[PDB]
């Protein structure tokens, strides 16, 4: 739950459309490493996942935020936005049974979506597009060596 | 503003890194998502995403699309289906019609959007991971100013 050492980090490879792909399952913990721009005062975004349970499709997001260059720890058991996609409509899921099933399935995934949503400068003015507010954004999980501890 | 347009009236957005799409003018009332599916793909969905702010409060707004084959989907910028207010690292669903209109008005003046693929399955119903691999191309366009004179 705290930032790691630069030898136990397993970085995900960034694709197109903000995909991040790992060589193994994500597991319990992912870390988002953010290097902000000099004129940036605030950023937020998420890690996104889509899962399916007998006919029903769900979208699941873990939200992060920061005011400076930092590494944010994300607990894969604690998603904050869970929606079921019925056609082109969404329905919010509050059922604890359904949610656990989704998180268990998410922990076995090898890829995620990384999105920046909003960003503002030191004076509170919005930066558009938000992605331009960062100099770099990466995601890593712990190594198998670091998991033994 | 719902039937797909001819090649000379389309204004394509330029795709960036984190699935950003940028236009040389404001998006306005209508955006179209042009999708070429893969041969083994039976279903896809995703969205166009926007973030706006209203005196202190930040909102995330999404317009959801879906398809079962290569097609162009029309998205009405006045009809978002998921609107959340971001309080810290928590979300709250917005149902207030006044707040929603304020957001859509602001969204229509934007020159960029986020394009995301969420889920995809093959002909036999099995999930494709990552979902983005199910498409051969995905683009977004808005009408030209010439096509807008067509009231």
Number of domains into which chain B is organized: 1
The residues facing B122 across adjacent strands are B41
Strands A111-121, A40-53: pairing is antiparallel
Alpha-carbon dihedral sign for residues A113, A40, B15, B44: positive
Element (H, E) at B15: strand B14-15
d(CA A149, CA A3): 15
Q: Are B111 and B25 contacting, i.e. CB atoms less than 8 angstroms apart? A: yes
Structure tokens at A66: 């920061």
Token couple for B32: 């179209």
User: What's the token pair of residue B143?
Assistant: 């009408």
Nearest chain A alpha carbon to B55: A124
Give the span between the Cα atoms of A124 and A9, in whole angstroms: 34
Q: Which residue has the tokens 């005011």?
A: A67
Beta strands in B28-129 (DSSP E): 30-37, 41-54, 57-67, 71-76, 82-87, 90-93, 112-122
Upper half-sphere CA count for residue B64 (Cβ side, 13 Å): 19
What is the C-alpha to C-alpha distance for residues B40 and A92, in angstroms, rounded to an integer?
31
What is the DSSP code string of A37-83? -TTEEEEEEEEEEEEEETTEEEEEEEEEEESSSEEEEEETT--SEEE
Q: Is A126 on the interface with B (CB under 8 A)?
A: yes
| A80 contacts B90? CB cut-off 8 A | yes
Q: Nearest 10 degrees: CA dihedral of B128, B132, B135, B141?
A: 150
The structure was resolved to a resolution in Å of: 2.7
Chain-centroid distance of CA B61 in Å reads: 10
What is the domain range of residue A28? 1-149
Q: How many CB atoms sit inside 10 A of residue A107's CB?
A: 14
For chain A, the first-to-last Cα distance in angstroms comes to 13
Query: CA-CA distance, A71 to A90, in Å (whole number)?
Result: 31
Residue in A80, A129, A138 to test binding to B, most B beta-carbons within 10 Å: A129
Q: Do A52 and B119 touch (CB under 8 A)?
A: yes
């Amino acid at each position: 739950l705290a930032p790691l050492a630069d030898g136990e980090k397993l970085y995900g490879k960034k694709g197109s459309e903000g995909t991040v792909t790992f060589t193994k399952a994500i597991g319990d913990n992912a870390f988002v490493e953010i290097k902000t721009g000099a004129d940036t005062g605030f950023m937020n975004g998420c890690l996104g996942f889509s899962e399916s349970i007998d006919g029903k499709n769900y979208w699941v997001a873990y939200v992060w935020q920061t005011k400076k260059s930092d590494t944010i720890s994300i607990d894969m058991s604690s998603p904050v936005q869970i929606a079921e996609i019925i056609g082109t409509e969404t329905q919010e899921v509050t059922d604890a049974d359904t949610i656990k099933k989704l998180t268990d399935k998410i922990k076995t995934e090898k890829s995620a979506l990384l999105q920046v949503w909003y960003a503002s400068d030191k004076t509170g003015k919005q930066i558009d597009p938000a992605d331009s507010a960062s100099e770099s954004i990466e995601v890593y999980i712990p190594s198998a060596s670091a998991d033994e501890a």
